[PDB]
Amino acid sequence: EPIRYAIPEELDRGSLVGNLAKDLGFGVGDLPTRNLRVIAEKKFFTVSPENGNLLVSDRIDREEICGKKSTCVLEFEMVAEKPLNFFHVTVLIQDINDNPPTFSQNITELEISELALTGATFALESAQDPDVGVNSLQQYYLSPDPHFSLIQKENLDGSRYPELVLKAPLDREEQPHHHLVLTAVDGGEPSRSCTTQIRVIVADANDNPPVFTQDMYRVNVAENLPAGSSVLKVMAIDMDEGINAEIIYAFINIGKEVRQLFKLDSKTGELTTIGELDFEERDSYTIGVEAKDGGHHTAYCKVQIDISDENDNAPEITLASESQHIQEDAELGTAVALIKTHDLDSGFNGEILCQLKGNFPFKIVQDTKNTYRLVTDGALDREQIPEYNVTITATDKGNPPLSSSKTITLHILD
Amino acid sequence: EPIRYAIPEELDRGSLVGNLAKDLGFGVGDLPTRNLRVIAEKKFFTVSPENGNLLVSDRIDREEICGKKSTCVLEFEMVAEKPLNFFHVTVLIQDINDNPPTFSQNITELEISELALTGATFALESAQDPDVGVNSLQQYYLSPDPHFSLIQKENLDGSRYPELVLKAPLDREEQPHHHLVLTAVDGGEPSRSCTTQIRVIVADANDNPPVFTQDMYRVNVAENLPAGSSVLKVMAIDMDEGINAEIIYAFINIGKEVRQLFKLDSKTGELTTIGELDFEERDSYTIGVEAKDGGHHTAYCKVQIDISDENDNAPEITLASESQHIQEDAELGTAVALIKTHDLDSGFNGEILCQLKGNFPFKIVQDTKNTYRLVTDGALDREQIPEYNVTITATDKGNPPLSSSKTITLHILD
Ligand SMILES: [Ca+2]
Ligand SMILES: [Ca+2]
Ligand SMILES: [Ca+2]
Ligand SMILES: [Ca+2]
Ligand SMILES: [Ca+2]
Ligand SMILES: [Ca+2]
Ligand SMILES: [Ca+2]
Ligand SMILES: [Ca+2]
Ligand SMILES: [Ca+2]
Ligand SMILES: [Ca+2]
Ligand SMILES: [Ca+2]
Ligand SMILES: [Ca+2]
Ligand SMILES: [Ca+2]
Ligand SMILES: [Ca+2]
Ligand SMILES: [Ca+2]
Ligand SMILES: [Ca+2]
Ligand SMILES: [Ca+2]
Ligand SMILES: [Ca+2]
């Protein structure tokens, strides 16, 4: 007694579903006398009491009725009169591919670090299709990109979902963004399609250690350099981004001799002096510099600071004599006093020229480069001149030249 | 004429350096008459005018005089009288191993990430030795540790510096700290030594992706569940530290049908309901959950939420008749009205028991599980009772049971 029909959805009003009169043993000779009607909470079908045909009266949208059910059937009752009887009529609504696939968003972003190995799989969002059956099964295609490809797997129910695969390593320092296009095409007639853009943001990874612009920082300064003066500036380049590019500079393998003399900026890398340079104490400094980032990648270089000799030391004079006593009967050339000179500076700043300032019966006789001898070159007499105030002046050959004066009293004994 | 001596440093006062009288052709017969003296800005040596010997007068510290020079010589002048002459005396001070090595700090810290490959080299700070020669060359020894070893290289000048090498991979999740002891021993007699402790801090690396406690979160709720009620709580474990352990929870591959129904906490991972559940619309929800950390490591699990059927729908009654008109001459059993019942709920909540509330000359005759027929079971007469107000009550078999009342007026025609 029950009867089932099968019509496609989205049929215009008046489309023939079937002949309920012919298909139930109802002769037309008593059709209007039985008043064939259709009772239903949702009025989707009507019956013409003239011929007994079951037609449609409203829009039959399968997605509004059943949704995503595999089978969409409608069960209503038909009422006849004289006598009153019920006729259960089932109507299976067939699904047509009238709805295209849709992604949740037109543009989707994905963050992938540079450390993604070749072959890494990244999950993608599947497209939804309001239809069922073959009109809902999707085929996913990715636009050709030399870095990314697409693999398509199936679930247990047969539904297909895309997954992004990496076929080329990602280098943010070469290309931080990748624009892909994913297209979902269902397997119905006609084949409806939709596209979406995938913005792949290459996340930074600490894979580039710091690199100094110079493997050796060699500079020459003077020892009279004041404290705090700028000596040089080391520079390191880190091609990464953010914390993986911030560089801190610091000294390594250093001692208190150099720690109390120089200062390295932890941010700008400027090398200054916190102490006093002295060419006589140390003429060359070799310091190791460390460049470290957030990823603990270290870079090492050496800095050599040369110091020039400045004429900041005056020649001192050392004298010696036989209790600074001279016999008035001494012969010409008798050693009266011994002179020793030395200058702490090097080069021509250390060479000394000793002079005899004044007019005395003596003369300077050079023996070595630093030892002089004061001999007699005139007559002596206690009752005439009892004492001589001999002044010795030694001047270096630097620029500006410095000198010192050493006066010794030489008594004349009888 | 110049003469050079060679004595070790740190000699007590009165130690014999040499016989300047014997070594310069000076007979003792005229030794005190020449008054042998030593002129020097830094008084380190003296000469006894009785025998002509050159002795020491103060502490001879080679580190205070020359520092770290390879050769430490002292050049002073000797003064003789009658006649006055100069005698240049050179004294080479030999270095003794009287100073032990020293590190810049007793405890040094080093940060090494877990990604350090087997064989990675890490620079160490060398020990300083105030002496020179073999008394300054250091031998570095590291305490045996199954993770670290020591390699020793030489510079161009022959000085030796230690470097730390990694022979076993570092896992912070297994051991975040490593306590090492580095010892520096110089090559002098006696061999002086010093130690230092190296605190190796294993820096964290995002190498542990999130892991869910359950690969499947299956729960069953009721459709009358209010909005905002706690459904379940997903949990992910990240064994890393800091940013590499903070986990965010979010839905993946979801649509507006489920997005408008549930809410996943991005921090606590608690799943709540922002919509109204309906067993008649959908009975099971399958949602994908993503667990992502700072290192972009993803973890995926599925959550299945089942819904129980609640008796929240009352059975509705559909009636039909021949214009609700009855002939008073109708035979017993004539179909007067047609009854159709259906309940949207499932199970026993959907099964319906139709009753005939009141006393009328009619009775309910069941045809199918949902269709009833009201037939005649008594006499009829228009002039006696012209109309009947038949009340139909249909009650479901749920808990609590719900029911509806449908009253139709049936006129008696003559
Ligand atoms: Ca449709
Ligand atoms: Ca459809
Ligand atoms: Ca479709
Ligand atoms: Ca890179
Ligand atoms: Ca990078
Ligand atoms: Ca870096
Ligand atoms: Ca100076
Ligand atoms: Ca100088
Ligand atoms: Ca000078
Ligand atoms: Ca010493
Ligand atoms: Ca020494
Ligand atoms: Ca030593
Ligand atoms: Ca680990
Ligand atoms: Ca870790
Ligand atoms: Ca992690
Ligand atoms: Ca409900
Ligand atoms: Ca229900
Ligand atoms: Ca019910």
Curated annotation (Swiss-Prot), chains A, B:
Ranges where the Cadherin domain occurs: 1-103, 104-212, 213-317, 318-414
Sites carrying sugar chains: N106, N389
Entry superkingdom: Eukaryota
Topological domain spans for side Extracellular: 1-414
Subcellular location: Cell membrane
The protein's role, per its UniProt record: Potential calcium-dependent cell-adhesion protein. May be involved in the establishment and maintenance of specific neuronal connections in the brain.
Name listed for the protein in its UniProt record: Protocadherin gamma-B3
Organism: Homo sapiens
Gene name of this polypeptide: PCDHGB3
